[PDB]
Amino acid sequence: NVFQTRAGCLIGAEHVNNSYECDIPIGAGICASYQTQSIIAYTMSLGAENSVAYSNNSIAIPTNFTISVTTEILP
Amino acid sequence: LIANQFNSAIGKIQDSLSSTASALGKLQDVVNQNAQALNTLVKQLSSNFGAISSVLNDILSRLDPPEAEVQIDRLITGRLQSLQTYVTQQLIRAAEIRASANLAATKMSECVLGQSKRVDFCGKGYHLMSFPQSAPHGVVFLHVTYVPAQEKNFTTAPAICHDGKAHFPREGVFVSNGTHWFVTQRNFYEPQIITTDNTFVSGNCDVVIGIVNNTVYDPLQPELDS
Amino acid sequence: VSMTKTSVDCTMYICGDSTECSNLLLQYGSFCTQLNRALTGIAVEQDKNTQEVFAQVKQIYKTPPIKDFGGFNFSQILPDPSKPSKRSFIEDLLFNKVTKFNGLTVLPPLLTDEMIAQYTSALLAGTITSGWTFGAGAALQIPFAMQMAYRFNGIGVTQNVLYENQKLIANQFNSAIGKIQDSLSSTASALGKLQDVVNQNAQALNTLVKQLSSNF
Amino acid sequence: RASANLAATKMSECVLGQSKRVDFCGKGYHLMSFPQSAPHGVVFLHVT
Numbered sequence: 257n258v259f260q261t262r263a264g265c266l267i268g269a270e271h272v273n274n275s276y277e278c279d280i281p282i283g284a285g286i287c288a289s290y291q292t293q294s295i296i297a298y299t300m301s302l303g304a305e306n307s308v309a310y311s312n313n314s315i316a317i318p319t320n321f322t323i324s325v326t327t328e329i330l331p
Numbered sequence: 332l333i334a335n336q337f338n339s340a341i342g343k344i345q346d347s348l349s350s351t352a353s354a355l356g357k358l359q360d361v362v363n364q365n366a367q368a369l370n371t372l373v374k375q376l377s378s379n380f381g382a383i384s385s386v387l388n389d390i391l392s393r394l395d396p397p398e399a400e401v402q403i404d405r406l407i408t409g410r411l412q413s414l415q416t417y418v419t420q421q422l423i424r425a426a427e428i429r430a431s432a433n434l435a436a437t438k439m440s441e442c443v444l445g446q447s448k449r450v451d452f453c454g455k456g457y458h459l460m461s462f463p464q465s466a467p468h469g470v471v472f473l474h475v476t477y478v479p480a481q482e483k484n485f486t487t488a489p490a491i492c493h494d495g496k497a498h499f500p501r502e503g504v505f506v507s508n509g510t511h512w513f514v515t516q517r518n519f520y521e522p523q524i525i526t527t528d529n530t531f532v533s534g535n536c537d538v539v540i541g542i543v544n545n546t547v548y549d550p551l552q553p554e555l556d557s
Numbered sequence: 558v559s560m561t562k563t564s565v566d567c568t569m570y571i572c573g574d575s576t577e578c579s580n581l582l583l584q585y586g587s588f589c590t591q592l593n594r595a596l597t598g599i600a601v602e603q604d605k606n607t608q609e610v611f612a613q614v615k616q617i618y619k620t621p622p623i624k625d626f627g628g629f630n631f632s633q634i635l636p637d638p639s640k641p642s643k644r645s646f647i648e649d650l651l652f653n654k655v656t657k658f659n660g661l662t663v664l665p666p667l668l669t670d671e672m673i674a675q676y677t678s679a680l681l682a683g684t685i686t687s688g689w690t691f692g693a694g695a696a697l698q699i700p701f702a703m704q705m706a707y708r709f710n711g712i713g714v715t716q717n718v719l720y721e722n723q724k725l726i727a728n729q730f731n732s733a734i735g736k737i738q739d740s741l742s743s744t745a746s747a748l749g750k751l752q753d754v755v756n757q758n759a760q761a762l763n764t765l766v767k768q769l770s771s772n773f
Numbered sequence: 774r775a776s777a778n779l780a781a782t783k784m785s786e787c788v789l790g791q792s793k794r795v796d797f798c799g800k801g802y803h804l805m806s807f808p809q810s811a812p813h814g815v816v817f818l819h820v821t
């Protein structure tokens with residue numbers, strides 16, 4: 257339970273080999289969070305990978321839609 | 332269907348605000364910062380800054396006039412620099428708040444009182460309309476946006492070669508479901524037969540890179556022959 | 558986009574490991590905490606800036622291996638996996654052109670330059686393969702030539718102009734990219750807007766450190 | 774911070790879509806843009 261990160265020595269947190277969204281940022285890519293219960297430190301994850309099926313004669317056209325309502329708060 | 336989706340979205344906004352309190356961190360942070368600045372400003376009064384005592388009536392009551400000025404000068408310099416630090420940081424924070432006030436005024440003018448094409452100005456999606464709401468020392472916008480949902484693969488072609496001339500869509504895009512060719516609007520699969528009322532002609536079939544063969548039915552010929 | 562996340566500690570800076578000086582310093586109240594708080598606020602905001610600028614795509618898209626974009630040639634700007642990092646050629650040219658112990662610390666950024674390169678690769682692949690539709694909801698593929706026809710139709714030039722001039726337009730775009738590459742490789746004055754930031758921060762720290770040598 | 778807000782605006786309205794704001798994305802009629810990273814900043818290539 258002693259991890260060496262590019263930002264310092266993190267003692268008390270269990271290093272893992274997964275990658276989730278950031279909960280508590282530490283630095284240089286590492287983020288820590290309370291999960292299976294102990295504190296873990298994992299490399300940050302930028303989002304689920306995807307690969308658009310590009311082809312020179314293929315197009316995708318929506319057949320349906322949603323109406324969404326979002327909230328934006330400004331001082 | 333659209334009315335039901337809109338109503339459900341409003342209901343979900345209501346439930347989200349009722350449940351999750353952290354939604355208004357942007358306003359709560361401003362309130363906390365101002366209260367913290369005033370708390371530190373007040374707490375500065377209990378500091379000696381080098382004088383014999385941090386309360387001014389003890390200095391005035393204990394020491395003679397010719398001697399009080401050293402202690403009082405120390406207190407005055409300390410409290411004066413404390414007050415200047417407070418004022419400077421307030422001026423900077425007020426500049427930031429004015430930047431947000433100008434952004435909010437712009438959002439209201441362009442997004443509420445109209446419909447805006449600026450991408451991701453008003454919520455992630457094609458923008459439809461917005462509703463303002465007050466909030467304590469701030470404003471909340473409810474952005475109603477159109478998001479495409481269900482996509483299907485279609486095979487496309489930039490132009491249609493008929494009779495030697497090349498036809499392009501008037502407004503839309505050519506798609507084929509595997510055996511037939513149709514023209515559709517680009518944001519909702521509503522396919523129409525390719526006529527001479529959906530396409531315009533330009534040049535011949537030797538220049539376009541990817542043209543395909545098909546027929547462009549003409550509405551005038553059957554009626555003229557009849 | 559972001560400065561350098563510097564931090565300081567007042568007690569170490571002013572009264573270096575000296576008990577008498579640190580007992581005198583306590584009479585100035587909360588000056589220390591206030592400064593540390595302001596610098597921490599700046600430090601966090603600096604990561605908020607990068608998050609807001611770059612993290613605008615939900616998923617990390619990728620370009621197909623069979624790059625047939627109707628004539629255009631993006632190999633200058635797309636990632637080059639042969640290199641250790643994912644940075645593209647022009648990104649490398651940009652990086653190669655931009656250049657103590659008194660309590661001063663330089664915290665590291667939260668998003669490492671490799672992760673930023675992954676974000677920009679995602680944005681670039683998304684725009685190339687799906688037009689502008691990855692901005693709103695899902696990403697819907699579309700042939701690049703048809704995307705460009707859409708873009709021309711967007712500025713009052715009908716579609717047929719692109720298709721009838723596709724090879725010419727592709728060549729002009731490729732040559733323009735080449736000229737950008739040569740301009741960045743040759744001249745160094747273009748990146749003044751970033752060099753001024755780095756210089757101003759370095760000069761501020763050098764003055765701060767030199768102030769310890771004064772009698773006062 | 775002001776520069777970062779302008780950069781975010783440009784990325785949203787220029788990289789992710791076409792812009793009809795004159796001279797927001799380079800002199801001329803805007804077609805597309807491509808982002809590139811740079812040390813402590815972002816560089817846009819504006820195709821017009």
Ligand SMILES: *[C@@H]1O[C@H](CO)[C@@H](O[C@@H]2O[C@H](CO)[C@@H](O[C@@H]3O[C@H](CO[C@H]4O[C@H](CO)[C@@H](O)[C@H](O)[C@@H]4O)[C@@H](O)[C@H](O)[C@@H]3O)[C@H](O)[C@H]2NC(C)=O)[C@H](O)[C@H]1NC(C)=O
Nearest residue numbers: 318319320321322323332333334335336337338339480481
């Ligand atoms: C576009 O997406 C819309 C939703 O995002 C689709 O609307 C939904 O379409 C169907 C039928 O209209 C329904 O979805 C499911 O329906 C089953 C069975 O329907 C029965 O029960 C519902 C609920 O009581 C009732 O409204 C129907 O009239 C039937 O009696 C339900 O068991 C599911 O729970 C689910 O609702 C929805 O009714 C409808 N949604 C809305 C909000 O109206 C729409 O069909 C999509 N468009 C296309 C072209 O596919």
Ligand SMILES: *[C@@H]1O[C@H](CO)[C@@H](O[C@@H]2O[C@H](CO)[C@@H](O[C@@H]3O[C@H](CO)[C@@H](O)[C@H](O)[C@@H]3O)[C@H](O)[C@H]2NC(C)=O)[C@H](O)[C@H]1NC(C)=O
Nearest residue numbers: 483484485486506507508509510511512513522523524525
């Ligand atoms: C692609 O779209 C076309 C256009 O709708 C589809 O063609 C149509 O398919 C239906 C069902 O197979 C045909 O209906 C059948 O034809 C006879 C005579 O017209 C009709 O009386 C019957 O009801 C019978 O079910 C329809 O005629 C046909 N349209 C034309 C113009 O021939 C096609 O099936 C679609 N292909 C795919 C793979 O989805």
Ligand SMILES: *[C@@H]1O[C@H](CO)[C@@H](O[C@@H]2O[C@H](CO)[C@@H](O[C@@H]3O[C@H](CO)[C@@H](O)[C@H](O)[C@@H]3O)[C@H](O)[C@H]2NC(C)=O)[C@H](O)[C@H]1NC(C)=O
Nearest residue numbers: 488491492493494495496536537540541542543544545546
């Ligand atoms: C769309 O339709 C046109 C006409 O229906 C197609 O053009 C045709 O292309 C074929 C193959 O290139 C030509 O065949 C040639 O015939 C001549 C004799 O006429 C022969 O000497 C050659 O060796 C060859 O077999 C055909 O003539 C030509 N039709 C014309 C010129 O009227 C076109 O290919 C179709 N589109 C696609 C994508 O296939």
Ligand SMILES: *[C@@H]1O[C@H](CO)[C@@H](O[C@@H]2O[C@H](CO)[C@@H](O)[C@H](O)[C@H]2NC(C)=O)[C@H](O)[C@H]1NC(C)=O
Nearest residue numbers: 258259260261270271272273274275297298299
């Ligand atoms: C994840 O945890 C550590 C990473 O710190 C892994 O330890 C090494 O992982 C690499 C690549 O995963 C292997 O090539 C090494 O052999 C591992 N070290 C040893 C001593 O075996 C660990 O294996 C990873 N575990 C899981 C389940 O992903």
Ligand SMILES: *[C@@H]1O[C@H](CO)[C@@H](O[C@@H]2O[C@H](CO)[C@@H](O)[C@H](O)[C@H]2NC(C)=O)[C@H](O)[C@H]1NC(C)=O
Nearest residue numbers: 306307308309310314316481482483484485621
């Ligand atoms: C359009 O077709 C393509 C290819 O036929 C689909 O992309 C593939 O989807 C399967 C799973 O359905 C994956 O295993 C493949 O890896 C995908 N191809 C690539 C190149 O990634 C695509 O999903 C279809 N579009 C829709 C809307 O279903």
Ligand SMILES: *[C@@H]1O[C@H](CO)[C@@H](O[C@@H]2O[C@H](CO)[C@@H](O)[C@H](O)[C@H]2NC(C)=O)[C@H](O)[C@H]1NC(C)=O
Nearest residue numbers: 311312313314539540541542623624625627700
């Ligand atoms: C779209 O891409 C496909 C795949 O590369 C092209 O198909 C090739 O066409 C050439 C000449 O027409 C043939 O020599 C190749 O053998 C084809 N390859 C495959 C895998 O089918 C197609 O030509 C492209 N579209 C256009 C308009 O050129």
Ligand SMILES: *[C@@H]1O[C@H](CO)[C@@H](O[C@@H]2O[C@H](CO)[C@@H](O)[C@H](O)[C@H]2NC(C)=O)[C@H](O)[C@H]1NC(C)=O
Nearest residue numbers: 624628629630631632633634637646731734735
């Ligand atoms: C796309 O552009 C690239 C970038 O220049 C070109 O490929 C290069 O061609 C030159 C001339 O032969 C040489 O430097 C190499 O052959 C290529 N570069 C590298 C780094 O390998 C070419 O114009 C286009 N490439 C393709 C594959 O279409």
